[model samples]
Target: GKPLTEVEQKAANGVFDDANVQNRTLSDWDGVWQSVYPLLQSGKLDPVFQKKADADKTKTFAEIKDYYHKGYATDIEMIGIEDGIVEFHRNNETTSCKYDYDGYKILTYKSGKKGVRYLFECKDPESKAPKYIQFSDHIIAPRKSSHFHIFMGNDSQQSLLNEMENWPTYYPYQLSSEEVVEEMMSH
Candidate 1:
């Protein structure tokens, strides 16, 4: 089982070394949504559709949501449907999203918050709220082999964008604007 600790939580610093990642920031959401907008919304305008149930209330709701290929849980649920909900998508009445660009087949969904909390609830339900999530192959000892991360509070767009930018920058050369655009078209 996954037993999270304070140091692991702190050093984790908005990044989790697990499969389920949450605690994303507005800016991170902004940058990613901007870059993968078409893919996330399926040719529709992807707007920020936050629920009107009071941001202060959502602040206390312990839901762990994410966008990805697959996951596993005893049972599962999705949010952002009905009940004063604001949703963004490429088409109407569509939940499943797909983007086939640059050899990447990305999919997104609108699963509710409660479900995310249940599936990703730390072994201890009362503690260990996430900061943010990230995907990485590099990590400290004892968890280096893992492939993904859910940063605790480090889910902000600045942090994520820095990492995303670093991804292509660390390569032999830079990706030209044309290549970047082509990557988008490939999907």
Candidate 2:
């Protein structure tokens, strides 16, 4: 099938919000983190994956790999912010050879005098990639900032593949916007 829609995006993003929490320890990440997406999609990403992602999510100190994603957050997305920011740090997790950041997906977003901008990052676990995405809804907003992020560790390799297809450079599944929307709706 395809991915989620704008409505589904709101709902899917809700799960990601729940997954990314402060006081999210390593063990907590080991539990529900991985399952959040599948659950967002079909309500299940395997119970075991949920257990581990959740376990890893609750950790305080973990290996903050070289690559990570950075970005800003709107009012709705920052609900889980603790310590004034949505902190998403990770440790040693394997990813895909085709994807960078060891196949791990970590992104961050921020805003300032300039505007809202985000970084897309991935760790090699071997070599790292300093990739990111940045955007802003306001043209002139001093201190325009959003410090929210998202991450997916060694849960499923398929996520990496899906990302590649969506990304411009590596996008192989060239489906038109309408077709993409239709495909996702059917799923």
Candidate 3:
């Protein structure tokens, strides 16, 4: 857990090095998502907006709300990963499949900032699962994922690198709304 905390602290400053990368598997993300979806939608995270307003006078609480309402929005209600299998609950439907680690990718965003995503390939072809999936949980090394931004589709992993929109994000189930607020403020 100390390694995990230190990694996040470095990442918060946009620091990532090839030497810091660690091999990760699906098991590292084993858990279910009690998405921040409901909380964001219900305005339970309003405290975050208030905090942001206090920290930055240029941004109003209302403006902060607009920013997060779009940034943290997600249609996925829940997801669970364990034993190499991931179950996605979206639109009240569920799709489950085991995903194999293909590799990882480094992406340079429009802001000229770089980020990394660990990739996975779907093994259950008969299932309604996407052929490829990737995760960005803000941690460079192996640690139980606290939350993540996921990109899923049949698109080839290479081209998926160019995708700049609509990353369905999720957060841990055990976090209280107050905890979520604190986490948000930290960023």
Candidate 4:
């Protein structure tokens, strides 16, 4: 059998790598809370670490928790995405507003991997919603995302694009903790 070329590896890890295009919309992420945040807080994902221990032979639960805690933690809580509106829940208040597509960005990582972020801008001038938001769910074309990493900022879209830290990752609000764990194990 032939080994995968770098281009093939890129394709296996990302989408739209060769074409430099994206066709995602806000509707692709429609739903409410029920992301990893809630389950992670409830210690439901600890078993995922336990399962990982089985695969690795010796990563203690403490070490595994530390890894996922830092890797998956997000400031924002629950999120809601609809046909044209995106809502965010954090602290004690919720912010929501309609958004328009601002196109997409292609980013090359230090590890030589490529990725894409679909961009959008707030439609309301006086809204509390993020001025710009980008979604990196590794999905292009039309389909609902299983999970997504989102980046947002009150400043310019470019600043948001420049951000490499603080991507708030989310999973489907509909799936239960067990279903999430099942998916985690498969991954």
Shift in Å, residue 9, candidate 1: 0.7
lDDT of 3 by residue, 19-70 (tens): 6677787887888776675787887887777888899978988887777677
Task: Give the runs in model 2 whose Cα sits over 4 Å from its true position.
Answer: 1-35, 44-93, 96-115, 120-130, 133-187
TM-score of 2: 0.18
TM-scores for the candidates: 0.20, 0.18, 0.84, 0.79
Instruction: Evaluate model 1: give its lDDT.
Output: 0.25
Worst 10 residues of 3 by lDDT: 1-10
Pitting candidate 1 against candidate 3, the one with the higher lDDT is 3
45 in model 2: Cα distance from truth in Å? 12
lDDT tens string, model 2, 93-139?
32222222221222322321221112223333553322222122221
**Candidate 4, 1-187: lDDT as tens digits:** 2444665445548633547454777787787754476667778887788888777866777787777776567767789877788888887788988988988888877877677788898879779988888988755545577788888888887897787755667877777778878988766
Clashing pairs in model 4? none
User: Which portions of model 4 show Cα errors greater than 4 Å?
Assistant: 1-12, 52-64
Local error of candidate 2 at residue 109 (angstroms): 15
Collision count for each candidate, in order: 25, 56, 0, 0
Higher-scoring candidate on lDDT, 3 or 4: 3
